[PDB]
Design a protein around this ligand. Structure first.
Ligand SMILES: Nc1nc2c(ncn2[C@@H]2O[C@H](COP(=O)(O)OP(=O)(O)NP(=O)(O)O)[C@@H](O)[C@H]2O)c(=O)[nH]1
Ligand SMILES: [Mg+2]
Length: 166
């Protein structure tokens, strides 16, 4: 048996959406990765208990000219991963806007996950873990501080999704 799970990544440009997906699927990291144009699609199948979860992963362009396309991506998604950058408070401040948009226009029972990415960059941290954790908890979302660079909580993010899908 095999279970298809559409997952979309949402967030401001530069937060590491593509790097998260590349690390999960291709097990690689590129400091020189270019901004996404349109969307990138990758897939990985993982054993969860007695089933196989085939993640159909939509890596969306964060650049504002692509925002209008977002509804196309979250439609039919089993989960949404909203990514911010722990070194830029602006991307966290903005988190509520992404959540709002997913509340207002997304599927009724989507699994929401919040990823605080670039957690390897601790010296220049701007978003305290506790504050982002508190927020994720308040909306009953999955939360992890991730690093695509160091492979911190990348698999764990998708494991939490596997646990919480119906
Ligand atoms: N140190 C560190 N750098 C990271 C991490 N994830 C991504 N980066 C870097 O951050 C920059 C932006 O990454 P990228 O994956 O392109 O972000 P994005 O959210 O996909 N941007 P876009 O929306 O424009 O496609 C790149 O220089 C990349 O190497 C991380 O976990 N740690
Ligand atoms: Mg990208």
């Amino acid at each position: 048996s095999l279970r298809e799970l559409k997952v979309c990544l949402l967030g401001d440009t530069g937060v590491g959406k593509s790097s998260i997906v590349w690390r999960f699927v291709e097990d690689s990291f590129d400091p020189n990765i270019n901004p996404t144009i349109g969307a990138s699609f990758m897939t990985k199948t993982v054993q969860y208990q007695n089933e196989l979860h085939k993640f159909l992963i939509w890596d969306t362009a964060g650049q504002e000219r692509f925002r209008a396309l977002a509804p196309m991506y979250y439609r039919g998604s089993a989960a949404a991963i909203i990514v911010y950058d722990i070194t830029k408070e602006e991307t966290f401040s903005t988190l509520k806007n992404w959540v709002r948009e997913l509340r207002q226009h997304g599927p009724p029972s989507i699994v929401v996950a919040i990823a605080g990415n670039k957690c390897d960059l601790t010296d220049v941290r701007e978003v305290m873990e506790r504050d982002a954790k508190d927020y994720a908890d308040s909306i009953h979302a999955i939360f992890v501080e991730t690093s695509a660079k160091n492979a911190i909580n990348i698999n764990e993010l998708f494991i939490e999704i596997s646990r919480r899908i119906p």
